[PDB]
Design a protein around this ligand. Structure first.
Ligand SMILES: [Mg+2]
Ligand SMILES: [Mg+2]
Length: 552
């Protein structure tokens, strides 16, 4: 029963404008009306977004907060929107292209959300396919304008997007298969809608082939070879992922030291698995021990479930406030192989509980759990589930901007890392195998800090990892030493960090900042850890600067 304020009204109106400007955002919100439409990716599209943003800030400028909730809203919006305008004004937004989260991927990805149960559904898919050309044309218009302004993505990233988009457009690629395999009730589409689908998918194929040609012929020849984006671009991207403007040299130095600590810890844990064992030697023992393997998905679900239910029942009303509807975290098998464990939060009304989904790679039916205990806490309780479910629980106290728009990577990923560290400190990882798995994920995330900042700023390589200053080649060998992952995933992560600067440290740096907030509050009389967790999580997703000011 907290009534909406004038500030919430501005926040809600801005949200409606965002929905109006980006119809893809409405479909990803479940809002009907604009199922076939894309945002305007052209420069005029970007100017319109920026203008709406500038007008929203102006509207907020003379509005005093009516309560603490308003003050957080003002702070979060001023931070997020102000940063958005700094990035737009920098000119680099127009050049946006990378291997993972840029318009070429986004324009294709939206199709995966669309239902396929009625003729009208298939008309929507066909109609969206038929709008892929205009989306791509506007995107090419922004890339071309940035190019004329001497701002072009690294050659590596352009080459990757030419590869990815050529598969989308190929004879047997995404859009072709969409039209060829379409069904309704396990039967072919009626001919009239099928023809709409064939025409639309055909246009989508041609548009992705044109982006390919443009990239190849106009952009690639002027693309820089150098991947590093440099200090000025880096600091703005870093802010986008963390919501704090960190000291980059200081953060880099912290990350190098933190990686060294985590390796030292792994060496200690190795000796707890087998006296005097190297990390690699201990890992063969864990990975070859019949006791650390589970057979079949039923037993796997049972294992996840017990861990989750135990964490809830032990932490409830001790370290966290967990309302009854949040105590359920259903552990499940992913219908598809999303390549790891993922979390889906509860419905707004809590009729669907939070769920955790383990993706089983094709043909796999035995499961090693030592490395995934920590992941259960990260993706589940007290990580993502408590954070996401608490924000959702407090939704009546949160305007639509806060609920549906404002989201900061360092905040939510930092929290899941905080959560793993808390479970270490509370004695959940005493088994050396489980401990090792936690350290592995921390080590990989500490390596991200060193790589991202070191490479993009061309900093001195730490003597443990090389000499001179960082180059992408040196960075690749460094990742290979610190990430226990497949060859193909290593190559992907490498490419990602190079093309998406600022995001990779958001995990460990988010953890650091969360821990700094808690450490400060701990210095004071009456600190109460449960009360801290409640106040913080109630706020929802905000930048780390904003969170610190809401809490200190
Ligand atoms: Mg040192
Ligand atoms: Mg996650």
């Amino acid at each position: 029963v907290r009534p909406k304020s004038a500030i919430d009204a501005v926040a809600d109106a801005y949200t409606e404008k965002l929905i109006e400007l980006n119809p893809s955002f409405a479909t990803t919100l479940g809002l009907p009306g604009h199922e076939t439409e894309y945002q305007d990716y052209s420069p005029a599209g970007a100017a319109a977004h920026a203008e709406a943003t500038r007008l929203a800030l102006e509207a907020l400028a003379g509005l005093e907060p009516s309560d603490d909730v308003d003050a957080v809203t003002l702070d979060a919006m001023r931070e997020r929107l102000g940063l958005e305008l700094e990035i737009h004004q920098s000119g680099w937004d127009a050049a946006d292209l990378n291997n993972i989260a840029s318009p070429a991927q986004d324009i294709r990805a939206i199709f995966d959300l669309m239902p396929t149960d009625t003729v009208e559904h298939w008309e929507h898919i066909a109609g969206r396919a038929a709008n892929v050309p205009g989306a791509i044309e506007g995107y090419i218009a922004s890339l071309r304008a940035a190019k004329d302004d001497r701002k072009v993505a690294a050659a590596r990233q352009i080459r990757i997007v030419i590869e990815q988009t050529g598969r989308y457009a190929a004879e047997d690629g995404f859009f072709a298969k969409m039209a060829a395999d379409a069904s309704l009730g396990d039967a072919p589409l009626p001919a009239e809608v099928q023809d709409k689908l064939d025409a639309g998918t055909s246009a989508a194929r041609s548009a992705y082939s044109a982006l390919g040609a443009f990239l190849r012929d106009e952009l690639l020849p002027v693309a820089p070879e150098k991947d590093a984006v440099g200090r000025e671009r880096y600091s703005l991207a870093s802010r986008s992922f963390i919501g704090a403007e960190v000291d980059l040299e200081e953060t880099y130095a912290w990350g190098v030291q933190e990686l060294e600590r985590l390796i030292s810890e792994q060496e200690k844990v190795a000796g707890q698995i087998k006296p005097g064992a190297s990390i690699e030697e201990a890992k063969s023992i864990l990975n070859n021990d019949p006791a650390r393997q589970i057979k079949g998905t039923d037993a796997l679900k049972a294992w996840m479930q017990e861990l989750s239910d135990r964490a809830v029942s032990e932490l409830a009303d001790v370290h966290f406030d967990i309302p009854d509807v949040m105590k359920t975290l259903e552990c499940m098998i992913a219908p598809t192989d999303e390549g790891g464990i993922y979390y889906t939060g509860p419905s707004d009304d809590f009729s669907r509980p939070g769920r955790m989904w383990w993706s089983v790679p094709a043909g796999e039916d035995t499961f090693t759990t030592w490395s995934e205990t920590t992941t259960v806490f990260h993706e589940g309780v007290p990580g993502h589930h408590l954070q996401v479910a608490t924000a959702t629980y407090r939704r009546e106290l949160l305007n639509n901007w806060r609920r549906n728009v404002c989201w900061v990577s360092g905040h939510g990923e930092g929290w899941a890392l905080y959560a793993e560290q808390l479970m270490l400190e509370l004695g959940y990882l005493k088994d050396p195998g489980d401990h090792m798995g936690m350290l592995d994920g921390q080590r990989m995330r500490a390596a991200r800090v060193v790589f991202d900042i070191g490479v993009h700023l061309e900093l001195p390589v730490p003597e443990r990892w090389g000499t001179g200053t960082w180059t992408p080649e040196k960075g690749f060998d460094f990742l290979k030493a610190n990430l226990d992952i497949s060859e193909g995933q290593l190559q992907f992560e490498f490419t990602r960090y190079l093309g998406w600067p600022g995001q990779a440290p958001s995990y460990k740096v988010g953890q650091r900042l969360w821990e700094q907030i808690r450490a400060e509050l701990e210095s004071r009389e009456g600190f109460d850890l449960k009360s801290f967790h409640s106040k913080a999580l109630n706020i929802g997703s905000v930048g780390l600067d904003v969170l610190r000011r809401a809490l200190l």
